[PDB]
């Protein structure tokens, strides 16, 4: 989906490779409030603070 092909019946969702964001930090921390929500354009906004 980085390019723009046609929406054919071929497998578009054929791979789900992992590119997350990771806590790069010197000291360990904790998670106290994680929330998933909606934005203006109906997409899953997720905010998490550490």
């Amino acid at each position: 989906s980085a390019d723009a092909p046609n929406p054919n019946n071929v497998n578009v969702q054929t791979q789900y490779r992992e590119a997350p964001v990771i806590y790069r930090g010197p000291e360990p921390s904790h998670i106290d409030q994680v929330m998933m929500s909606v934005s203006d354009n109906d997409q899953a906004l997720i905010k998490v603070l550490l």
């Binding site: 929330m35 929500s37 909606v38 934005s39 203006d40 906004l45 905010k47």
Partner: protein
């Protein structure tokens, strides 16, 4: 943000909720204008603009 039949907005999206939803805190415009609709008819439709 008046809407002079009902209340002000009936939500008027709450501010601390609007800070977490990644939405702008807003209330719309309301105007009153004429037209030249018919050959002998002028409407007074009351619309909103942004």
């Amino acid at each position: 943000g008046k809407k002079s039949s009902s209340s002000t907005k009936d939500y008027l999206t709450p501010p601390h909720e609007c800070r977490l939803r990644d939405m702008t805190y807003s209330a719309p415009i309301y105007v009153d204008i004429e037209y030249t609709r018919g050959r002998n008819i002028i409407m007074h439709k009351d619309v909103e603009i942004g």
